[PDB]
Amino acid sequence: ARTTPIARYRNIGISAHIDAGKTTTTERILFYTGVNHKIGEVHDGAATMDWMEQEQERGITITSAATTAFWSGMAKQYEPHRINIIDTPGHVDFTIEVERSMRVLDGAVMVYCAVGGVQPQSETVWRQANKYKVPRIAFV
RNA sequence: GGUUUAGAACGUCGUGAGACAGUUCGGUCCCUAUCUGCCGUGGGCGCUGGAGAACUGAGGGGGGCUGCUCCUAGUACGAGA
Numbered sequence: 040a041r042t043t044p045i046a047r048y049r050n051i052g053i054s055a056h057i058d059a060g061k062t063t064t065t066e067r068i069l070f071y072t073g074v075n076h077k078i079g080e081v082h083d084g085a086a087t088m089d090w091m092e093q094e095q096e097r098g099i100t101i102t103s104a105a106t107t108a109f110w111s112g113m114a115k116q117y118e119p120h121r122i123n124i125i126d127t128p129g130h131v132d133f134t135i136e137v138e139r140s141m142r143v144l145d146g147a148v149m150v151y152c153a154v155g156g157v158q159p160q161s162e163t164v165w166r167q168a169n170k171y172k173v174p175r176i177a178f179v
Numbered sequence: 180g181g182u183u184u185a186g187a188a189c190g191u192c193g194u195g196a197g198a199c200a201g202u203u204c205g206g207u208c209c210c211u212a213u214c215u216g217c218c219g220u221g222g223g224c225g226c227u228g229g230a231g232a233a234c235u236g237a238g239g240g241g242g243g244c245u246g247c248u249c250c251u252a253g254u255a256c257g258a259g260a
């Protein structure tokens with residue numbers, strides 16, 4: 040009945056400053072987990088997370104988009120864990136979306152630009168995740 | 180085509196012939212280039228015995244325009260846009 044065991048579930052968010060690479064990382068995650076047959080790119084509007092017309096045209100994520108992927112590993116090490124990822128908007132003008140998601144999620148991948156690193160909205164999502172007391176990993 | 184000839188009519192002015200930075204219809208645009216100039220093209224002589232070819236380069240002319248798409252690069256800049 041249960042397609043995957045309880046232990047093999049990973050509810051995570053991808054949170055960061057604007058244009059830190061959240062949607063691109065989500066697209067590569069979907070590609071390497073096989074659900075997406077083309078990598079696409081955000082600035083051409085081919086990103087799957089940026090499904091709304093405004094997101095496609097303006098190159099930004101305005102909504103928290105939740106999807107699910109199956110990951111075994113680089114070397115197929117593990118039985119397929121199911122990662123429930125949510126791509127959140129790093130805009131300070133959409134903070135309720137990230138707070139909304141981050142309440143329910145169990146982990147956060149905080150993305151940081153290698154050049155800019157910690158930025159204002161990275162600090163904002165940091166505070167939100169801290170008040171929700173969630174575990175974090177970081178992706179530079 | 181307009182502008183200003185000769186015809187005709189409207190409005191207005193005048194008694195009238197006629198007239199109007201008023202309008203309307205119709206109304207003949209000539210020249211075989213001597214010289215200069217210019218574009219090409221040769222004949223004569225010269226360049227120091229004659230001739231055939233290859234050049235040199237003074238000097239002169241020609242040409243010089245620019246959009247859009249992509250990469251750099253969603254890069255620099257920008258809280259973002």
Ligand SMILES: Nc1nc2c(ncn2[C@@H]2O[C@H](COP(=O)(O)OP(=O)(O)O)[C@@H](O)[C@H]2O)c(=O)[nH]1
Nearest residue numbers: 056057058059060061062063064080081082100
């Ligand atoms: N050069 C480069 N561009 C990236 C990288 N990650 C994302 N981008 C581009 O940077 C822009 C913003 O990244 P995006 O994935 O949309 O991030 P988000 O807006 O923070 O969710 C897009 O044009 C991406 O294609 C990266 O690691 N290197």
Ligand SMILES: [Mg+2]
Nearest residue numbers: 062098099100
């Ligand atoms: Mg994005």
Ligand SMILES: [Mg+2]
Nearest residue numbers: 058097098099
């Ligand atoms: Mg952008």
Ligand SMILES: [Mg+2]
Nearest residue numbers: 184185186206
């Ligand atoms: Mg006559």
Ligand SMILES: [Mg+2]
Nearest residue numbers: 184185186187
């Ligand atoms: Mg008359």
Ligand SMILES: [Mg+2]
Nearest residue numbers: 239240241242
């Ligand atoms: Mg010259």
Ligand SMILES: [Mg+2]
Nearest residue numbers: 240241242243
């Ligand atoms: Mg010249």
Ligand SMILES: [Mg+2]
Nearest residue numbers: 082083252253
């Ligand atoms: Mg581009």
Ligand SMILES: [Mg+2]
Nearest residue numbers: 096097259260
């Ligand atoms: Mg704008």
